[PDB]
Amino acid sequence: AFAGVLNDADIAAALEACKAADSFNHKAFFAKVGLTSKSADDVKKAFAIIDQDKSGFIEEDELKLFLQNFKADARALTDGETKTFLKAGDSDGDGKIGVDEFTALVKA
Amino acid sequence: AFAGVLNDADIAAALEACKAADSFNHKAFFAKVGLTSKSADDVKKAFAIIDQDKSGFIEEDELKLFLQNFKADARALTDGETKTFLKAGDSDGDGKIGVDEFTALVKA
Ligand SMILES: [Ca+2]
Ligand SMILES: [Ca+2]
Ligand SMILES: [Ca+2]
Numbered sequence: 001a002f003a004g005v006l007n008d009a010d011i012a013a014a015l016e017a018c019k020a021a022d023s024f025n026h027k028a029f030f031a032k033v034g035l036t037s038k039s040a041d042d043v044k045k046a047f048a049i050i051d052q053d054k055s056g057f058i059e060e061d062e063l064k065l066f067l068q069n070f071k072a073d074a075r076a077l078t079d080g081e082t083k084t085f086l087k088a089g090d091s092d093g094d095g096k097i098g099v100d101e102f103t104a105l106v107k108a
Numbered sequence: 109a110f111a112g113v114l115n116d117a118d119i120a121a122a123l124e125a126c127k128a129a130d131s132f133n134h135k136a137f138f139a140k141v142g143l144t145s146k147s148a149d150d151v152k153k154a155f156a157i158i159d160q161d162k163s164g165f166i167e168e169d170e171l172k173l174f175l176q177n178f179k180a181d182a183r184a185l186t187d188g189e190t191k192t193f194l195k196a197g198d199s200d201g202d203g204k205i206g207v208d209e210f211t212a213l214v215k216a
């Protein structure tokens with residue numbers, strides 16, 4: 001769903017780097033895919049895509065499927081990867097990621 | 109923000125019909141703009157656009173600005189219009205519209 005927003009080549013490179021189980025790193029991904037240099041606006045658009053059910057939060061099953069929003073056939077993150085990603089972004093400890101937590105996670 | 113999803117002509121007709129203060133009717137708008145025949149998926153995409161801050165709910169100030177998501181220079185809804193729209197869609201009475209309430213509002 002990041003057709004004319006990211007860059008096909010950027011997404012491909014990002015995905016190739018984390019193909020191995022437990023090799024994912026959110027900072028490396030965001031930087032490579034080109035999201036870190038985006039406007040708060042486009043970051044909110046990205047958030048909405050990742051929030052599959054539009055609940056206003058990225059819950060753990062949505063996070064597990066993170067890569068699939070970029071390339072449909074991308075692998076699922078491992079439990080370890082998901083938990084690490086969740087822990088890094090979940091500032092208030094409610095177990096999900098809201099738009100502000102997501103924005104801080106992206107912008108670093 | 110409904111560039112290749114709606115139809116320029118549909119949006120224009122929809123907007124012309126409710127230009128007068130208190131002339132808005134959500135069922136007439138949705139039918140005219142072509143949202144009622146959309147897949148639950150595209151309806152969720154529309155929801156996300158209307159939910160300006162990505163909180164997961166369309167709050168009353170967002171509802172007031174409903175038309176502005178279709179054409180940037182569209183008028184704001186009146187208080188009467190907003191309240192009526194809110195009342196029609198807010199099934200659980202919490203004062204905001206969640207994705208499921210929005211979907212039912214669209215599909216009729
Ligand atoms: Ca969600
Ligand atoms: Ca949180
Ligand atoms: Ca909102």
Ligand SMILES: [Ca+2]
Binds near residue numbers: 200201202209
């Ligand atoms: Ca409600």
